[PDB]
């Protein structure tokens with residue numbers, strides 16, 4: 111008989127092992143996931159007005175939305191056992207399934223109200239004909255603190271997609287408020303043209319009584335992906351039954367992309383999924399003074415297309431401005447991207463679902479945060495969106511996980527030499543100011559939620575490494591490596607201006623022993639942070655289910671003036687390893703997550719890495735081991 115021994119070689123076929131045998135092998139301890147089973151898209155988050163607690167939601171086992179709550183954003187508690195479900199299919203509006211949805215804190219009966227996609231027909235896919243009535247948007251109300259959502263005893267409040275529009279997908283309603291949208295809509299078509307008159311109205315805007323907007327994601331057959339915008343009828347904040355259609359406030363031509371070569375923001379693909387609408391400043395979230403930001407997943411494919419197969423799942427973001435609808439008979443308001451990028455460059459990262467976290471929340475009160483924040487939760491599919499080549503699912507007993515909660519805001523990059531590196535077309539940043547000599551850049555800021563980061567390094571063991579410089583090729587083991595696979599690695603890599611043209615590759619090797627290693631390094635050839643997983647798992651060679659393809663993201667290191675002197679901006683790294691869940695963060699303006707399913711208990715070594723091409727200076731290298739338990743009650 112075979113009992114799991116991770117100090118010994120892995121069996122050739124993991125899929126032959128007994129159920130639940132691999133349950134803990136690759137399981138994270140500081141991440142959001144159900145007690146067992148599979149987790150899908152994150153949805154339905156809301157900061158309970160009454161208790162100030164923050165509720166988190168996610169599709170679970172493809173049988174509905176499950177929930178959990180937190181008071182500090184560090185630890186979570188399941189709403190209930192047996193799946194901890196909030197709402198499941200089988201109603202009159204959702205006889206087949208319950209898809210993503212979002213919550214209005216003070217809705218029907220003045221309680222948290224869920225607006226979600228109720229499904230009545232399958233299959234549903236952008237590459238095939240759409241069955242009329244497949245997806246409708248229904249309402250459900252929170253009961254018993256929010257441990258359950260009861261569907262309203264009536265049909266959907268948005269019972270059909272736009273009239274006679276051949277949509278590719280009509281789902282994932284996301285609710286939000288906006289001063290600019292209210293102003294542009296409450297104005298005149300001629301008076302809402304001059305930003306002056308407009309801006310003057312936004313100043314007196316009052317959030318408390320503003321109407322809600324709903325953004326539904328999808329696209330149109332033969333046209334392109336799009337976001338369908340609605341709002342409480344007539345701008346009536348008390349109107350929850352009728353939702354007026356404002357049109358396709360954002361659409362792109364089929365498989366087109368941001369930029370001439372789709373370099374910084376993947377492609378718009380064939381269908382938009384899970385549109386989140388944000389309003390960011392330089393400190394957090396503000397629906398009155400914040401710039402419009404939209405995060406979304408796009409479904410793509412190579413040609414020839416294989417019906418019912420989305421080969422590419424990009425987790426994108428875009429920022430821009432909202433204006434009136436021109437002079438055409440189309441959308442009443444329109445979103446125009448000025449810049450776009452990736453919220454996470456991970457192949458398996460997708461469906462980021464976020465929510466405003468008020469400073470008045472119990473979470474922010476405890477941590478002492480004085481501003482409103484926007485926390486986003488990204489999905490890390492466990493099996494490559496179910497296209498994996500025989501992953502040992504029954505053996506693991508669970509599938510997928512959410513990534514660490516992330517704060518999103520406008521991040522600025524100061525003292526940037528205004529050169530070609532900054533003026534390139536179709537990038538993920540805009541210039542905030544400049545004298546043609548140095549400029550301030552503006553882009554999406556991405557950082558681990560502060561309380562979560564604090565919890566990750568509150569009881570961790572700290573081991574630093576001496577600053578180091580590598581010129582010739584070398585792989586240097588740390589003075590002391592962690593003895594577990596639960597740690598946070600931080601480091602700063604400084605490169606010479608001369609490395610830009612070089613074939614330089616510099617980083618670290620982690621989760622390493624003689625038979626295994628995972629490499630993380632910066633590459634100038636394509637200005638990308640890369641995660642080489644070719645040798646990650648000693649079990650991958652005979653178990654194709656464990657993907658081992660290379661992961662990478664674009665990260666441009668600008669020329670800056672740090673000390674009255676020019677230099678290539680410092681690569682500020684933060685790698686969080688929560689067993690197999692690996693999250694690479696950089697300069698607060700970059701995230702790449704993936705699975706690193708190493709097998710041996712001894713694969714915990716960490717080494718400096720340099721390919722000899724060019725030179726690199728490592729500074730402030732440190733390792734915090736341990737992380738923490740995100741689910742105390744389990």
Ligand SMILES: OC[C@H]1O[C@@](CO)(OC[C@@]2(OC[C@@]3(O[C@H]4O[C@H](CO)[C@@H](O)[C@H](O)[C@H]4O)O[C@H](CO)[C@@H](O)[C@@H]3O)O[C@H](CO)[C@@H](O)[C@@H]2O)[C@@H](O)[C@@H]1O
Nearest residue numbers: 150151169172209210234235236281383384420461495496
């Ligand atoms: O879960 C619905 C939400 O998922 C999003 C974001 O990922 O897009 C999903 C999509 O692919 C899901 C998939 O299956 C899921 O639902 C099945 C039941 O419908 C369930 O059996 C699967 O176990 C579960 O993973 O759809 C097909 C099923 O044929 C499969 O290839 C997928 O992996 O769901 C839509 C419809 O099935 C597809 O158009 C889309 O790719 C978000 O947009 C949805 O709200």
